Design a protein around this ligand. Sequence first.
Ligand SMILES: [Tb+3]
Ligand SMILES: [Tb+3]
Ligand SMILES: [Tb+3]
Ligand SMILES: [Tb+3]
Ligand SMILES: [Tb+3]
Ligand SMILES: [Tb+3]
Ligand SMILES: [Tb+3]
Lengths: 189, 196
Amino acid sequence: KINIYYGKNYPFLCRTVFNIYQNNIKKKTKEICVNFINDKTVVEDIKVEFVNSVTSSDKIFAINLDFLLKTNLYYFTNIITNVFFQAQYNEWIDFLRNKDIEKNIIPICEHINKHLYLNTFLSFHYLTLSDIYIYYEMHKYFSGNITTNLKYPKQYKNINRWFRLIKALLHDHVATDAELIQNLKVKEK
Amino acid sequence: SKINIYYGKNYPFLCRTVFNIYQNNIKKKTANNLNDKEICVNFINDKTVVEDIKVEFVNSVTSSDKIFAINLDFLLKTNLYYFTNIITNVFFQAQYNEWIDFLRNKDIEKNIIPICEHINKHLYLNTFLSFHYLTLSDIYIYYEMHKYFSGNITTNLKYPKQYKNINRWFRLIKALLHDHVATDAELIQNLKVKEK
Ligand SMILES: [Tb+3]
Ligand SMILES: [Tb+3]
Ligand SMILES: [Tb+3]
Ligand SMILES: [Tb+3]
Ligand SMILES: [Tb+3]
Ligand SMILES: [Tb+3]
Ligand SMILES: [Tb+3]
C-alpha cells in the first residue's frame, strides 16, 4: 500500500507508470497497490505515504515507481547503457526545471522539433520515461483539444509525429482510466 | 569500460568518494577471493566547465555532482543509494531527493543558520541522516557542511559549538570515510583549495 497525495497537480506520470504495471500483471497470467488520493492541503507537488511520508514531485517519484513496479521505463529489466539513459532523463528534467512552460513554449519546441528530425524517440530507439514525461508537458499544446494551440502541431511536424506515436503507445494504458482523462481535460479548461 | 567526468572549479567530491569506496571494495574482494569486469572512472580537470560536471562514456551528458553520484552507486554497487524490503529502499531514495531539494537553489552561506537548525534537529534523535547506517544522504550533506564544521576556516569555528548534534554526526561521517578519503590526496587538496 503506497498512498500518493496530490493537489492542484495530478501525477499523470506516476499514474501512467502505475497503469502500465497493472496491465503488465493482467497479461503475465504479491501485487503492490498504489493509491492516488486527492488532498486539498498540498500546493503544487505530491506527498507520498508508505504503509512515514515524504515530499516529491510527479517527474521525480515516477522514477521510484518504475524501480518498484519494474515497468521497464527507467530501470531496464548493459548497465552502462542504462546509466547513460538515466542521465539523459535528468537532462530533460533540468531542461524544464523552474521554466515557465507556457512562456518558453517556443524555445522548448524548437529544441524538441530539431531533436526529433532524425530521432523517433526522445531517448534511444524505444519508449522511455523521457518520452512520457515530455508527452504530458506537451499534451496541452499538441493534443489538438485546444483549438488555439493548433499552430504548434503544424509548425513543429516532428513533435506532432512523435506525439502521435507516444499517444498510440499509451492508448492501451491511459485511454480507459477516465480519471487520468478527467484531469487532462480540467488542466486544459 | 571507461567513464570520464569533466569538472570546472567545482570538484565532484560525492562522485569521487563513491568511486573510492568502490575501489576499496574491490581491494577487499580480490584479497581473499583467489579462485575467481572493473570500471575506470577518470576525474579530468577542464577549464571550459563552469559549475557542473560533464560526463563522457567510452557520447556525453551534463549532470551535477549531487545527482550523478546516484548513477555511480547504481553502476558500481557501492550500496549507498541502491541497496544490494524494496519499498524501504524506495523510501530512502525519496529521502535523498528531499535533501537535494532542501539545498536546491539555496545560498548555503546566507541560509546557514536555518539549514543548520533543520539538520541539527533531525540528528538529535537520529544517528545517521537516513536510517541507522551510512547512506548517500550522509555523504552529500557532509561535503556541503564540511567548510563549516571541519574547523579549517577560523571564522566558521562557531558552528561546531552551536550545533553539537551536527558536530557529533560530522565526526562520525569523517571517521567512516577516513579509509576512503584521507588517502586520496587529490580530494584532500581540493578540500584545502575550496576552503582556502
Ligand atoms: Tb499526514
Ligand atoms: Tb521530510
Ligand atoms: Tb527490450
Ligand atoms: Tb553506445
Ligand atoms: Tb537489480
Ligand atoms: Tb530559529
Ligand atoms: Tb582502518
